[PDB]
Design an enzyme around this catalytic site. Structure first.
Site, PDB file in Angstrom:
ATOM      1  N   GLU A   1      -0.857 -13.170   0.948  1.00 45.72           N
ATOM      2  CA  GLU A   1      -1.443 -13.276  -0.375  1.00 45.72           C
ATOM      3  C   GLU A   1      -0.566 -14.115  -1.296  1.00 45.72           C
ATOM      4  OE1 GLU A   1      -2.132  -9.121  -1.259  1.00 45.72           O
ATOM      5  OE2 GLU A   1      -4.057  -9.122  -0.216  1.00 45.72           O
TER       6      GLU A   1
ATOM      7  N   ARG B   1       0.823  -1.211   0.000  1.00 47.16           N
ATOM      8  CA  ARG B   1       0.000   0.000   0.000  1.00 47.16           C
ATOM      9  C   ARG B   1       0.856   1.260   0.000  1.00 47.16           C
ATOM     10  NH1 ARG B   1      -5.640   1.598   1.551  1.00 47.16           N
ATOM     11  NH2 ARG B   1      -6.040  -0.660   1.532  1.00 47.16           N
TER      12      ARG B   1
HETATM   13  N1  LIG Z   1      -8.258  -3.934   2.426  1.00 49.43           N
HETATM   14  C1  LIG Z   1      -7.683  -4.331   3.603  1.00 49.43           C
HETATM   15  C2  LIG Z   1      -8.355  -4.164   4.805  1.00 49.43           C
HETATM   16  C3  LIG Z   1      -7.721  -4.392   6.017  1.00 49.43           C
HETATM   17  C4  LIG Z   1      -6.404  -4.761   6.058  1.00 49.43           C
HETATM   18  C5  LIG Z   1      -5.676  -4.985   4.860  1.00 49.43           C
HETATM   19  C6  LIG Z   1      -4.337  -5.456   4.853  1.00 49.43           C
HETATM   20  C7  LIG Z   1      -3.746  -5.808   3.686  1.00 49.43           C
HETATM   21  N2  LIG Z   1      -4.425  -5.734   2.522  1.00 49.43           N
HETATM   22  C8  LIG Z   1      -3.921  -6.486   1.352  1.00 49.43           C
HETATM   23  O1  LIG Z   1      -2.538  -6.667   1.495  1.00 49.43           O
HETATM   24  C9  LIG Z   1      -1.826  -5.793   0.594  1.00 49.43           C
HETATM   25  C10 LIG Z   1      -1.420  -4.540   1.322  1.00 49.43           C
HETATM   26  O2  LIG Z   1      -0.514  -4.881   2.391  1.00 49.43           O
HETATM   27  P1  LIG Z   1       0.197  -3.709   3.209  1.00 49.43           P
HETATM   28  O3  LIG Z   1       1.162  -4.295   4.165  1.00 49.43           O
HETATM   29  O4  LIG Z   1       0.673  -2.663   2.273  1.00 49.43           O
HETATM   30  O5  LIG Z   1      -1.092  -3.185   3.989  1.00 49.43           O
HETATM   31  P2  LIG Z   1      -1.259  -2.345   5.338  1.00 49.43           P
HETATM   32  O6  LIG Z   1      -0.927  -3.238   6.469  1.00 49.43           O
HETATM   33  O7  LIG Z   1      -0.536  -1.064   5.172  1.00 49.43           O
HETATM   34  O8  LIG Z   1      -2.838  -2.100   5.381  1.00 49.43           O
HETATM   35  C11 LIG Z   1      -3.557  -1.591   4.237  1.00 49.43           C
HETATM   36  C12 LIG Z   1      -4.539  -0.545   4.708  1.00 49.43           C
HETATM   37  O9  LIG Z   1      -5.593  -1.167   5.486  1.00 49.43           O
HETATM   38  C13 LIG Z   1      -5.742  -0.421   6.679  1.00 49.43           C
HETATM   39  N3  LIG Z   1      -6.402  -1.239   7.689  1.00 49.43           N
HETATM   40  C14 LIG Z   1      -5.899  -1.827   8.821  1.00 49.43           C
HETATM   41  N4  LIG Z   1      -6.808  -2.404   9.571  1.00 49.43           N
HETATM   42  C15 LIG Z   1      -7.991  -2.189   8.878  1.00 49.43           C
HETATM   43  C16 LIG Z   1      -9.330  -2.525   9.150  1.00 49.43           C
HETATM   44  N5  LIG Z   1      -9.734  -3.199  10.234  1.00 49.43           N
HETATM   45  N6  LIG Z   1     -10.265  -2.122   8.263  1.00 49.43           N
HETATM   46  C17 LIG Z   1      -9.883  -1.442   7.182  1.00 49.43           C
HETATM   47  N7  LIG Z   1      -8.655  -1.074   6.821  1.00 49.43           N
HETATM   48  C18 LIG Z   1      -7.751  -1.476   7.716  1.00 49.43           C
HETATM   49  C19 LIG Z   1      -4.343   0.074   7.004  1.00 49.43           C
HETATM   50  O10 LIG Z   1      -4.365   1.115   7.974  1.00 49.43           O
HETATM   51  C20 LIG Z   1      -3.945   0.551   5.607  1.00 49.43           C
HETATM   52  O11 LIG Z   1      -4.550   1.804   5.302  1.00 49.43           O
HETATM   53  C21 LIG Z   1      -2.766  -5.577  -0.590  1.00 49.43           C
HETATM   54  O12 LIG Z   1      -2.440  -6.477  -1.639  1.00 49.43           O
HETATM   55  C22 LIG Z   1      -4.174  -5.801  -0.004  1.00 49.43           C
HETATM   56  O13 LIG Z   1      -4.993  -6.649  -0.801  1.00 49.43           O
HETATM   57  C23 LIG Z   1      -5.655  -5.202   2.455  1.00 49.43           C
HETATM   58  C24 LIG Z   1      -6.335  -4.810   3.610  1.00 49.43           C
END
Ligand SMILES: Nc1cccc2cc[n+]([C@@H]3O[C@H](COP(=O)(O)OP(=O)(O)OC[C@H]4O[C@@H](n5cnc6c(N)ncnc65)[C@H](O)[C@@H]4O)[C@@H](O)[C@H]3O)cc12
EC number: 3.2.2.6
Length: 140
Positions: A82, A10
């Protein structure tokens, strides 16, 4: 259900992931990216099920995109989760390389080292249409 799942970091690959989504939809593919298609419920189960549903797994390798996977042996990192799902389901994995440096396999947890064995596509800012055409050839 979607033909293509887009996995991305992200904080570094969100713009390219979105650009890929637009292009692939214009060419007739149903695409899953979380910000468009993840809806209500426990996101861990829904995201894993969405990877399982899609034949093609497009992995956006922006700079440092696998860094948070390193030493994540509990598989808490979401790109790691994933990737492991896509590998263990035998998906058609299509890495998209955008400034990414290939790490040595042994810095990554064993359950995702195989991601490095897939033929990747280099993202070309100067030749984007040609890059997209090559991605479409790789999709099943
Ligand atoms: N859609 C999604 C919802 C929730 C968590 C996700 C985590 C990962 N992903 C998948 O993994 C890759 C990114 O890894 P990543 O490590 O880049 O992601 P992040 O950890 O930064 O979180 C991503 C964003 O979700 C926010 N967050 C945290 N808790 C949350 C919550 N209860 N409800 C809503 N949003 C929340 C967090 O604050 C940021 O805005 C992508 O391919 C994607 O498909 C997608 C997510």
């Amino acid at each position: 259900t979607p033909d293509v799942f887009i996995s991305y970091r992200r904080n570094s690959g969100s713009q390219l992931a979105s650009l890929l989504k637009v292009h692939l939809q214009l060419h007739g593919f149903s695409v899953f990216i979380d910000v468009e298609k993840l809806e209500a419920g426990k996101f861990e189960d829904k995201l894993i099920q969405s990877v399982m549903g899609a034949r093609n797994f497009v992995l956006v390798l922006s700079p440092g995109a696998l860094d948070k996977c390193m030493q994540d042996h509990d598989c808490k990192d979401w790109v790691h989760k994933e990737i492991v799902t896509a590998l263990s389901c035998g998906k058609n994995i299509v890495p998209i390389i955008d400034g990414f440096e290939w790490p040595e396999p042994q810095v990554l947890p064993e359950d995702m080292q195989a991601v490095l064995t897939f033929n990747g596509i280099k993202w070309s800012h100067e030749y984007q249409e040609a890059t997209i055409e090559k991605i479409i050839r790789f999709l099943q």
